[PDB]
Amino acid sequence: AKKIITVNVNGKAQEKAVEPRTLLIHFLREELNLTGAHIGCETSHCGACTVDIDGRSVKSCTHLAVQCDGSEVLTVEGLANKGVLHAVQEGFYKEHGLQCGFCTPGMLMRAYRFLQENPNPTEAEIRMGMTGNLCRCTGYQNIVKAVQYAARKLQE
């Protein structure tokens, strides 16, 4: 039977009723039309569905929506503030960290959290810290540059 829950997404209350088996990724994409987060696998490897739940990076395809009643969820749609891109979005843009854009929302949400865990990351730390996100287009090289760009912007 559907469970009534209220999950805070991007600072806004989302009151819905969903079956317990509803994966958070489908909840966001199907119930709220926050289609930024994507699905790239069924085994939890790609990280294209990465969103920030209660202060941590989490693959929404491996988490139940019903486990989020009262949680604070952040999706790519909520990074920009008053239209101004977050340092992380600006970094990916300026450094050409995206081609098809499919792994991008997940990369951005992960980089957003990573930069708080580690404000001044080395390249090795960046590659390792972004290791849960797969990309088919970039070859990652520009993505580490994008993260380095954002890391620098946040310190200034």
């Binding site: 994409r29 926050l34 289609t35 930024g36 987060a37 994507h38 699905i39 999706t75 790519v76 749609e77 990074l79 920009a80 891109l85 979005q89 990916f92 843009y93 300026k94 050409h96 995206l98 854009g101 499919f102 991008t104 929302p105 951005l108």
Partner: peptide
């Protein structure tokens, strides 16, 4: 810089499953 980026970095791309 790319003209495409704007929508993709804000989750406004339009893929088949969207």
């Amino acid at each position: 810089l790319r003209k495409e980026d704007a929508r993709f970095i804000q989750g406004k791309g339009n893929y088949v499953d969207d």
